[PDB]
Design a protein around this motif. Sequence first.
Motif, PDB file in Angstrom:
ATOM      1  N   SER A   8       5.031  -3.645  -5.013  1.00 15.92           N
ATOM      2  CA  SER A   8       4.551  -4.468  -3.910  1.00 15.92           C
ATOM      3  C   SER A   8       3.029  -4.504  -3.922  1.00 15.92           C
ATOM      4  O   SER A   8       2.390  -3.488  -4.182  1.00 15.92           O
ATOM      5  CB  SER A   8       5.037  -3.886  -2.587  1.00 15.92           C
ATOM      6  N   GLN A   9       2.453  -5.664  -3.645  1.00 18.22           N
ATOM      7  CA  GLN A   9       1.003  -5.814  -3.615  1.00 18.22           C
ATOM      8  C   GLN A   9       0.593  -6.708  -2.467  1.00 18.22           C
ATOM      9  O   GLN A   9       1.246  -7.706  -2.185  1.00 18.22           O
ATOM     10  CB  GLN A   9       0.495  -6.424  -4.926  1.00 18.22           C
ATOM     11  N   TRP A  10      -0.502  -6.343  -1.818  1.00 16.86           N
ATOM     12  CA  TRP A  10      -1.015  -7.098  -0.675  1.00 16.86           C
ATOM     13  C   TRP A  10      -2.437  -7.576  -0.950  1.00 16.86           C
ATOM     14  O   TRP A  10      -3.055  -8.254  -0.123  1.00 16.86           O
ATOM     15  CB  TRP A  10      -0.997  -6.213   0.574  1.00 16.86           C
TER      16      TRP A  10
END
Length: 142
Positions: A8-10
């Motif tokens: 997951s990446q933001w």
Amino acid sequence: GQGGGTHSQWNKPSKPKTNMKHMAGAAAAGAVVGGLGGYMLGSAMSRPIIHFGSDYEDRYYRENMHRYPNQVYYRPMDEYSNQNNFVHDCVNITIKQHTVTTTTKGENFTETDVKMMERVVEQMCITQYKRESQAYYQRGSS
């Protein structure tokens, strides 16, 4: 390698800002009269060496001499009445142009320093003075 990690990446990239300005322009560095009104410089000379008490005083004098005046204005000896202090008037104009300039910028002078700063410049003003004083003397002062 082996293993795994957070998929997951933001975070998202941004765009840089580049521009070029290879230019030049006018500038100033003071060069405004220091309240003298009407005084002009003479010549530059190597500042002298004056000793007071011992090598201790003489070395401290030479330690800091880089910050002291090495120039004098003209010789207002023609004013006559102020004969002995005429030198001092010559030195006071060059010294106030220098001492305040360096102090206010990042310096300070102790009693020894404020006494010696006059002595270094007086000797140079004497160098200008006697060169001229021999002329009034050879004139017979009459």
